[PDB]
Design an enzyme around this catalytic site. Structure first.
Site, PDB file in Angstrom:
ATOM      1  N   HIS A   1     -26.797 -44.425  34.150  1.00 21.62           N
ATOM      2  CA  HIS A   1     -25.361 -44.790  34.012  1.00 21.62           C
ATOM      3  C   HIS A   1     -24.496 -43.547  33.768  1.00 21.62           C
ATOM      4  O   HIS A   1     -23.739 -43.493  32.787  1.00 21.62           O
ATOM      5  CB  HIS A   1     -25.190 -45.832  32.925  1.00 21.62           C
ATOM      6  CG  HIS A   1     -25.613 -47.179  33.365  1.00 21.62           C
ATOM      7  ND1 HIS A   1     -26.781 -47.755  32.923  1.00 21.62           N
ATOM      8  CD2 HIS A   1     -25.043 -48.046  34.225  1.00 21.62           C
ATOM      9  CE1 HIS A   1     -26.900 -48.945  33.482  1.00 21.62           C
ATOM     10  NE2 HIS A   1     -25.851 -49.145  34.291  1.00 21.62           N
TER      11      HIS A   1
ATOM     12  N   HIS B   1     -23.943 -41.986  39.380  1.00 20.30           N
ATOM     13  CA  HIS B   1     -23.777 -43.439  39.636  1.00 20.30           C
ATOM     14  C   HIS B   1     -22.323 -43.725  40.027  1.00 20.30           C
ATOM     15  O   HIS B   1     -22.084 -44.414  41.049  1.00 20.30           O
ATOM     16  CB  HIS B   1     -24.246 -44.245  38.421  1.00 20.30           C
ATOM     17  CG  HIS B   1     -24.011 -45.710  38.525  1.00 20.30           C
ATOM     18  ND1 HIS B   1     -24.634 -46.482  39.458  1.00 20.30           N
ATOM     19  CD2 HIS B   1     -23.239 -46.549  37.800  1.00 20.30           C
ATOM     20  CE1 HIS B   1     -24.273 -47.754  39.303  1.00 20.30           C
ATOM     21  NE2 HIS B   1     -23.401 -47.820  38.300  1.00 20.30           N
TER      22      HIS B   1
ATOM     23  N   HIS C   1     -15.998 -47.487  36.614  1.00 30.59           N
ATOM     24  CA  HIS C   1     -16.512 -48.842  36.286  1.00 30.59           C
ATOM     25  C   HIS C   1     -17.539 -48.767  35.154  1.00 30.59           C
ATOM     26  O   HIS C   1     -17.791 -49.809  34.545  1.00 30.59           O
ATOM     27  CB  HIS C   1     -17.078 -49.543  37.534  1.00 30.59           C
ATOM     28  CG  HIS C   1     -18.482 -49.156  37.842  1.00 30.59           C
ATOM     29  ND1 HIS C   1     -18.788 -47.972  38.467  1.00 30.59           N
ATOM     30  CD2 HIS C   1     -19.654 -49.770  37.575  1.00 30.59           C
ATOM     31  CE1 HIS C   1     -20.107 -47.881  38.577  1.00 30.59           C
ATOM     32  NE2 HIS C   1     -20.659 -48.975  38.041  1.00 30.59           N
ATOM     33  N   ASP C   2     -18.142 -47.609  34.901  1.00 28.05           N
ATOM     34  CA  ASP C   2     -19.187 -47.459  33.846  1.00 28.05           C
ATOM     35  C   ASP C   2     -18.805 -46.337  32.866  1.00 28.05           C
ATOM     36  O   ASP C   2     -19.706 -45.843  32.172  1.00 28.05           O
ATOM     37  CB  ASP C   2     -20.574 -47.210  34.450  1.00 28.05           C
ATOM     38  CG  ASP C   2     -21.397 -48.460  34.729  1.00 28.05           C
ATOM     39  OD1 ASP C   2     -21.190 -49.494  34.043  1.00 28.05           O
ATOM     40  OD2 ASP C   2     -22.276 -48.383  35.616  1.00 28.05           O
TER      41      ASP C   2
ATOM     42  N   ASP D   1     -22.216 -51.716  43.121  1.00 30.93           N
ATOM     43  CA  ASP D   1     -22.881 -51.408  41.841  1.00 30.93           C
ATOM     44  C   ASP D   1     -24.391 -51.369  42.035  1.00 30.93           C
ATOM     45  O   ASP D   1     -25.018 -50.498  41.407  1.00 30.93           O
ATOM     46  CB  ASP D   1     -22.529 -52.419  40.760  1.00 30.93           C
ATOM     47  CG  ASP D   1     -22.739 -51.843  39.381  1.00 30.93           C
ATOM     48  OD1 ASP D   1     -23.004 -50.631  39.291  1.00 30.93           O
ATOM     49  OD2 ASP D   1     -22.618 -52.610  38.420  1.00 30.93           O
TER      50      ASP D   1
ATOM     51  N   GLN E   1     -39.248 -55.835  40.232  1.00 29.41           N
ATOM     52  CA  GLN E   1     -38.335 -55.473  41.355  1.00 29.41           C
ATOM     53  C   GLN E   1     -38.294 -56.595  42.404  1.00 29.41           C
ATOM     54  O   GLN E   1     -37.191 -56.847  42.938  1.00 29.41           O
ATOM     55  CB  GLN E   1     -38.725 -54.125  41.973  1.00 29.41           C
ATOM     56  CG  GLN E   1     -38.384 -52.934  41.080  1.00 29.41           C
ATOM     57  CD  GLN E   1     -36.897 -52.836  40.818  1.00 29.41           C
ATOM     58  OE1 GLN E   1     -36.130 -52.377  41.658  1.00 29.41           O
ATOM     59  NE2 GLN E   1     -36.470 -53.281  39.646  1.00 29.41           N
TER      60      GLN E   1
HETATM   61  N1  LIG Z   1     -29.722 -51.207  40.877  1.00 29.31           N
HETATM   62  C1  LIG Z   1     -30.376 -51.816  40.125  1.00 29.31           C
HETATM   63  C2  LIG Z   1     -31.299 -52.573  39.381  1.00 29.31           C
HETATM   64  C3  LIG Z   1     -32.691 -52.399  39.791  1.00 29.31           C
HETATM   65  N2  LIG Z   1     -32.933 -51.477  40.819  1.00 29.31           N
HETATM   66  N3  LIG Z   1     -33.726 -53.086  39.226  1.00 29.31           N
HETATM   67  C4  LIG Z   1     -33.423 -53.963  38.233  1.00 29.31           C
HETATM   68  C5  LIG Z   1     -34.497 -54.705  37.649  1.00 29.31           C
HETATM   69  C6  LIG Z   1     -34.198 -55.616  36.657  1.00 29.31           C
HETATM   70  C7  LIG Z   1     -32.860 -55.850  36.180  1.00 29.31           C
HETATM   71  C8  LIG Z   1     -31.818 -55.152  36.729  1.00 29.31           C
HETATM   72  C9  LIG Z   1     -32.094 -54.210  37.770  1.00 29.31           C
HETATM   73  C10 LIG Z   1     -31.006 -53.492  38.364  1.00 29.31           C
HETATM   74  O1  LIG Z   1     -29.753 -53.822  37.818  1.00 29.31           O
HETATM   75  C11 LIG Z   1     -28.747 -52.772  37.762  1.00 29.31           C
HETATM   76  C12 LIG Z   1     -29.354 -51.623  36.941  1.00 29.31           C
HETATM   77  C13 LIG Z   1     -28.894 -51.493  35.483  1.00 29.31           C
HETATM   78  C14 LIG Z   1     -27.885 -52.506  34.964  1.00 29.31           C
HETATM   79  C15 LIG Z   1     -26.866 -52.839  36.035  1.00 29.31           C
HETATM   80  C16 LIG Z   1     -27.569 -53.546  37.167  1.00 29.31           C
HETATM   81 MG   LIG Z   2     -21.775 -51.486  34.201  1.00 31.64          MG
HETATM   82 ZN   LIG Z   3     -22.584 -49.464  37.372  1.00 35.06          ZN
END
Ligand SMILES: N#Cc1c(N)nc2ccccc2c1O[C@@H]1C=CCCC1
Ligand SMILES: [Mg+2]
Ligand SMILES: [Zn+2]
Length: 313
Positions: A68, A72, A106-107, A217, A269
């Protein structure tokens, strides 16, 4: 006025593609962003002195966390740039201005923890904002940076255009709260299928902009496999640190966030691609046909995770 940003040939061509990776040279990311604003919006949208000052204050207020981070921010802004460029006539002058800034911001000041961990920690931000905790903070941080002397990139808008763009940016940032995505996509699904979807309806546009924000996102899952696979490590580095902090509060975290259960990641995943990513890019492709390459790239990467599970990598 007559000052354009130009990229080297390879970037100039690859930047137009959904699956573009912005590269490991941090000091090129601001120019990449200004390049995208100039082509997306115009060389006139922002006074270049003020945009440059806004970009560097936004960069400063992103933390050195594994996922984050500033990278990103620019990555998510690039996905929005690709969507806007492949859908030229569907978006207003204000929407093109607002959405790129929304994605970059956004973050803002993310610490690498979910809204859930703030709530269980009893973080002050969880008392100030009961839902979409971090996302209300990110919008707050955006408004604060806009109000620094010399940073108001929107100064030349009228009072009502200014109010409209800040409202486009607020909804855009709130929508990046994945807890709101499920309901937003379900509603968009129904509206598309019953034929009642109408882009002249503001409440409908809002919903469609929210799905675009979710799509930008999550755009790590739409890259070429080596980018997708290496970004996943950065995402999981945060998840496992959060898992650690949960254990410090005396709470077993869900197995996804537990660094003792790394074996479970590939299946984790699959769940995420089927439960979140594929539905997201499916509905997005239905509403905005030219975003199909995101759905295709996302399916390619689901298959690559299936291969990891089947021992084939
Ligand atoms: N891109 C992505 C991603 C990812 N590859 N894998 C995930 C696996 C489980 C839950 C969220 C996952 C995800 O969610 C974002 C990452 C962090 C929080 C904001 C949403
Ligand atoms: Mg966010
Ligand atoms: Zn984000």
């Amino acid at each position: 006025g007559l000052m354009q940003f130009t990229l080297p040939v390879r970037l100039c061509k690859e930047i137009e593609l959904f699956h573009f990776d912005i590269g490991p040279f941090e000091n090129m990311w601001p120019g990449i962003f200004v390049y995208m604003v100039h082509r997306s919006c115009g060389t006139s949208c922002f006074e270049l002195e003020k945009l440059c000052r806004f970009i560097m204050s936004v960069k400063k207020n992103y933390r050195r966390v594994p996922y984050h981070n500033w990278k990103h921010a620019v990555t998510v802004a690039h996905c929005m740039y690709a969507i806007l460029q492949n859908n030229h006539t569907l978006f207003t002058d204000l929407e093109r201005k607002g959405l790129l800034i929304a994605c970059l911001c956004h973050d803002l000041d993310h610490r690498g923890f979910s809204n859930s961990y703030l709530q269980k920690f009893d973080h002050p931000l969880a008392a100030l904002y009961s839902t979409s905790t971090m996302e209300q903070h990110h919008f707050s941080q955006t408004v604060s940076i806009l109000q620094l002397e010399g940073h108001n990139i929107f100064s030349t808008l009228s009072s009502s255009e200014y109010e409209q763009v800040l409202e486009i940016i607020r909804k855009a940032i709130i929508a990046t709260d994945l807890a709101l995505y499920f309901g937003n996509r379900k509603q968009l699904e129904e509206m598309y299928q019953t034929g009642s979807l109408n882009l002249n309806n503001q409440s409908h546009r809002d919903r469609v902009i929210g799905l675009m924000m979710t799509a930008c996102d999550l755009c790590s899952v739409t890259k070429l496999w080596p980018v997708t696979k290496l970004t996943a490590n950065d995402i999981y580095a945060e998840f496992w640190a959060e898992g650690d902090e949960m254990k410090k509060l005396g709470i077993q975290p869900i197995p996804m966030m537990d660094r003792d259960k790394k074996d479970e990641v590939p299946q984790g995943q699959l769940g995420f691609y089927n439960a979140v990513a594929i539905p997201c890019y499916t509905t997005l492709t239905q509403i905005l046909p030219p975003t199909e390459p995101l759905l295709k790239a996302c399916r390619d990467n689901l298959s690559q995770w299936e291969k990891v599970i089947r021992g084939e990598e």
